[PDB]
């Protein structure tokens, strides 16, 4: 929608629920996400560093 994500991208459920909270509270609109399952190399991979 209006959220500011690719459709199909991997992020943290905390950022994901706080951008939904900050998006409905201003204009009004819930992101969809599906929770996913990886592995220990891809989980590793994928840090914040």
Same mark, same amino acid.
């Given at each position: 929608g $209006?959220?500011? =994500? &690719?459709?199909?991208?991997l @992020?943290? #459920? /905390?950022? =994901?629920? %706080?951008?939904? #909270?900050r998006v409905?509270?201003? !204009? *009004?609109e819930? %992101? /969809? *996400?599906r929770?996913? &399952?990886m !592995? @220990?190399?891809? %989980? $590793? &991979? /994928?840090?914040?560093?």
């Amino acid at each position: 929608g $209006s959220t500011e =994500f &690719l459709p199909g991208s991997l @992020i943290d #459920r /905390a950022e =994901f629920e %706080a951008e939904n #909270r900050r998006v409905v509270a201003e !204009g *009004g609109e819930p %992101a /969809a *996400g599906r929770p996913v &399952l990886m !592995g @220990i190399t891809k %989980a $590793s &991979l /994928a840090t914040d560093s």
